[PDB]
C-alpha cells in the first residue's frame, strides 16, 4: 500500500 514515492521528503536532498 504505502510506497516511498509518496513520502513528503521522497525527492528532497538530504543535505
Amino acid at each position: 500500500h504505502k510506497i516511498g514515492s509518496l513520502a513528503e521528503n521522497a525527492f528532497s536532498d538530504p543535505a
Epitope: 510506497i3 521528503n9 521522497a10 525527492f11 536532498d13 538530504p14 543535505a15
Partner: antibody, heavy 114, light 113 residues
C-alpha cells in the same frame, strides 16, 4: 557532507548468505525511507527494495522476495540487506540510496561464486 | 511490473549541440489522481547513479539548466541542450509510481569529437 558508507561485500558461495550494511551521516537518517538498488557487471540498474522510517513498511522486488530481508537500525543510522540462498544471478554491485534516489552509497560488489 | 523502454546508444552528439533521450512506459505513470513519478538518472563510469530530473521535469540539486525533462503518461524525453564533455555516461529512465520501481536499460551518451 552526506555520507552513505557501505560494507559487507565480497565473495560468497552459491546457496550462502551475506549481510550488507549502509551507514549514514550528514542527515537525519531516521526521517527517510531507504532503498537498495543493484547493478550486475556491465548491466543496468535493478531495484531491490525500500524500507520506511519506522520499519512498518518494507517493499521488495519480486526477484528477491523470500530470500532477502531489508532492515534498519535508526540508533546506529544503518541500513541492512540480509541475503540468503544467493545465486550467480545475484552477483552485482549493491547500492544504498536515501528516499527515491536522492543520495547514493559508493556500492559494494557481491560475487556469488564457488 | 511496468516495463521502461529506452535505446542503448544515443546518436553521437557534438559538443555544444543538443541531445535527446526518450523512454516509453508500458502503462501510465500517473499515480491514481496525482503526480507522475517518472525520473531520469545519470551514471558515470565507476560512479553510482545520480538523480537528474524527478517527477518528469524537476531538476534535482546541482543539476544545471541544460538538462530538462518533458512528457506525459507513457512517453518522456530528456533534453541535454548544450552538451559538455563531462556529460558523457549512461542515462536511465525510472518509474516509481508502483512497486517494484523499474528502470530502463540505460542510454549511453556518445560525444562526437
Amino acid at each position: 557532507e552526506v555520507q552513505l558508507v557501505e560494507s559487507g561485500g565480497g565473495l560468497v558461495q552459491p546457496g550462502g548468505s551475506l549481510r550488507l550494511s549502509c551507514a549514514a551521516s550528514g542527515f537525519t537518517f531516521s526521517r527517510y525511507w531507504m532503498t537498495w538498488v543493484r547493478q550486475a557487471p556491465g548491466k543496468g540498474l535493478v531495484w531491490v527494495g525500500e524500507i520506511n522510517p519506522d520499519s512498518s513498511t518494507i517493499n521488495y522486488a519480486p526477484s528477491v522476495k523470500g530470500r532477502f530481508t531489508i532492515s534498519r537500525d535508526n540508533a546506529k543510522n544503518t541500513l541492512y540487506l540480509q541475503m540468503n540462498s544467493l545465486r550467480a544471478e545475484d552477483t552485482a554491485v549493491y547500492y544504498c540510496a536515501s528516499g527515491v534516489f536522492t543520495s547514493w552509497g559508493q556500492g559494494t560488489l557481491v560475487t556469488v561464486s564457488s | 511490473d511496468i516495463v521502461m523502454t529506452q535505446t542503448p546508444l544515443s546518436s553521437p552528439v557534438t559538443l555544444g549541440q543538443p541531445a535527446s533521450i526518450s523512454c516509453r512506459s508500458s502503462q501510465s505513470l500517473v499515480h491514481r489522481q496525482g503526480n507522475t513519478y517518472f525520473h531520469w538518472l545519470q551514471q558515470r563510469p565507476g560512479q553510482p547513479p545520480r538523480l537528474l530530473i524527478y517527477k518528469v521535469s524537476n531538476r534535482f540539486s546541482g543539476v544545471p539548466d541544460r538538462f530538462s525533462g518533458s512528457g506525459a503518461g507513457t512517453d518522456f524525453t530528456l533534453k541535454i541542450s548544450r552538451v559538455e564533455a563531462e556529460d558523457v555516461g549512461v542515462y536511465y529512465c525510472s518509474q516509481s509510481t508502483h512497486v517494484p520501481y523499474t528502470f530502463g536499460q540505460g542510454t549511453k551518451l556518445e560525444i562526437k569529437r
